[PDB]
C-alpha cells in the first residue's frame, strides 16, 4: 500500500496509543523527533509518519516493552547508502514482501538489529483494478470502529522495518521505514491482491516491538494476512497526492 491517512493531532494520536508495559503498568508512549510530525489525510512515500518502536532503541537499559512514538521517513534508506541525499535513491522501498524480508540485505540486516516498528495510520488507501478498463476505484481501508468517530478512533497498526542512515560526508541520523506486505484476505481480494501486514491488538503489537524478548523467527510468525478489516469507496480527491483534506477519506456510494 502506497498511500495512507494519518491526520490526528499529536495528543489525540498519543491517547490512541495508550498501552501497558510487560508488568501491566499503564503508559502513554513518549515522543521522539516530535517536530517531524505533520498530520495529513494523504500521506505518500518520502513523507514522515509516526511509528512505534521499542524504548530499548534509545536507552541501553530501558524496559524493551516500553514504547516510543517517532516520525520516520517512509521509504527505507539503508545504512549503507553512499550518495549525499535520499532523493538520489533509485527506488523508494516503501513496501516489502513478507516472503522476501529474510532474502534481501536491505531488510534482513535491520531485522538483525531488532529494528521492528509499528507504522501508524488512520487507515490506508488502495486502488481497485477493474476488468475491461484502465480507471481504478480508490478505497479507504481501516480497522472496524466502535467528527465523533475521531474521538476514539482505533489506529491501524502495520508491521514495518526501519533503518538508520548518516550522510557520508556529515549530517543528522535519518530514521526511515518500509511496510511489510502480505496476500489480501478474502474480504479485500476484490480490491487488491496484497495488503499490509496488520498487527491486530496489544499482544501482536508488543511482540513485534519487543526485540529484546521476541526473536526475528518468532516475530515473523505475526506476519500474515488478516481478516479484521473494513473499507469504503472514496472520491477521486485522494488520487492527487497534493490534496490534503477530510474529503480524501469520506465515504461515497
Swiss-Prot record:
Marked site, Required to stabilize abasic sites, at 192
The positions flagged as active site in the entry are: 1, 126
Which portion of the complete protein is shown here? 2 to 270 of 354
Q: What activates or inhibits this protein?
A: Formation and reversal of DNA-protein cross-link depends on DNA context. Catalyzes formation of the thiazolidine linkage in presence of abasic sites in single-stranded DNA. Mediates the reversal of the thiazolidine cross-link in presence of double stranded DNA.
The protein's assembly and partners: Interacts (via PIP-box motif) with PCNA.
Gene Ontology CC, one term:
replication fork
* Gene that specifies this protein: HMCES
Protein's recorded name: Abasic site processing protein HMCES
Superkingdom: Eukaryota
